[PDB]
Amino acid sequence: DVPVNLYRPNAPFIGKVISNEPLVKEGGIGIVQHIKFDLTGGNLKYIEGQSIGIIPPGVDKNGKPEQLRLYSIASTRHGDDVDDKTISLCVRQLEYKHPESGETVYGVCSTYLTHIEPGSEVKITGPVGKEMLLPDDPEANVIMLATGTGIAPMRTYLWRMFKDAERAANPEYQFKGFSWLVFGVPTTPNILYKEELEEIQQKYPDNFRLTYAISREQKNPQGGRMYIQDRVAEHADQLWQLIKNQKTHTYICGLRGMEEGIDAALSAAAAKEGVTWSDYQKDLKKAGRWHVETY
């Protein structure tokens, strides 16, 4: 029932770009694009939490073909238009430093994707992943801990849960649990999907809580920049009490390195009741209730 590897690298699906929109507003850092592809003429199906691969054109420095890079699917199974014909990605352009040969290095696939024109054909493989799947239990609690483009799987959950057109398209899933997104970004113009996230929080104030950690605008208690681990420590007691519920699932997605500060906050909270978090967390992973995708 979970689609996996309907397309593979040796014969990928050739989709077309429908749109390529910027998500970072003026005054923000970097480039993050929302890219929608046309899936008609193929049999690519997917569900929420999965990833697809993109094969960029060209060769590396050794003259070998460029391999695929994985990207979290940013749309629900129905696509952004709820017509079951499209798939969306949330792609940040990668670029970096001088202690890595030259001046500015541009990431191959992310530069390729963020500057791709509507009408362009793209090689798409997948879907892949069973680690970030949403339970069909409408009474689940869902804690979502995201930084940057780790917002992508979270957007697929929230849209399925809260969009009017999704609710009408998924009669079997009418969410009525509680979900809490803690979203870490550097600036307010960097809050990907800000308007849509904040509309959900207005319509469903008892089912969705939205917390930001904005590091260039907020300070933690120690005087440093506000990062997501600082917001998690602020609410560590509350987060631990929700995690104790049998219905609660936790999702962590973003760049690698956020997990260590989430654990240290939850460890101190758990210790107060004689629980060692690292052993409780092993049981949550085994039970399928602790979901991590960092990169």
Ligand X SMILES: Cc1cc2nc3c(=O)[nH]c(=O)nc-3n(C[C@H](O)[C@H](O)[C@H](O)COP(=O)(O)OP(=O)(O)OC[C@H]3O[C@@H](n4cnc5c(N)ncnc54)[C@H](O)[C@@H]3O)c2cc1C
Q: Which stretch binds ligand X (CB under 6 A): 107-115, 135-143, 189-197, 223-231?
A: 107-115
**Which sequence positions are flagged as catalytic?**
71-72, 253, 293, 295
Contact 232, 243 (CB under 8 A): no
The residue from 20, 75, 76, 110 that contacts ligand X (CB under 6 A) is 110
Q: Which stretch binds ligand X (CB under 6 A): 8-16, 67-75, 195-203, 265-273?
A: 67-75
Query: In angstroms, what is the minimal distance from the CB of 34 to ligand X?
Result: 11
The two tokens of residue 149 are 């483009």
Binding mask of the shown chain, residues 27 to 56, with x at each position contacting ligand X by CB under 6 A: ------------------------x-----
Query: In angstroms, what is the minimal distance from the CB of 245 to ligand X?
Result: 28
149 part of the interface to ligand X, by CB under 6 A: yes
CA-to-CA distance for 144 and 257, rounded, in angstroms?
A: 16
Cβ proximity to ligand X, 104 vs 202, nearer residue: 104
Query: In angstroms, what is the minimal distance from the CB of 158 to ligand X?
Result: 15
The set of residues, in sequence order, having a beta carbon less than 8 Å from that of 101 and lying 6+ positions away, is none
Query: In angstroms, what is the minimal distance from the CB of 24 to ligand X?
Result: 12
Amino acid type, 50: Q
Binding mask of the shown chain, residues 150 to 169, with x at each position contacting ligand X by CB under 6 A: --x-----------------
Cβ proximity to ligand X, 99 vs 221, nearer residue: 99
DSSP state string for 187-204: SGGG-TTHHHHHHHHHH-
Cβ proximity to ligand X, 147 vs 229, nearer residue: 147
- Which residues contact ligand X by CB under 6 A? 51, 69-72, 90-92, 94, 96-97, 100, 107-110, 149, 152, 293, 295
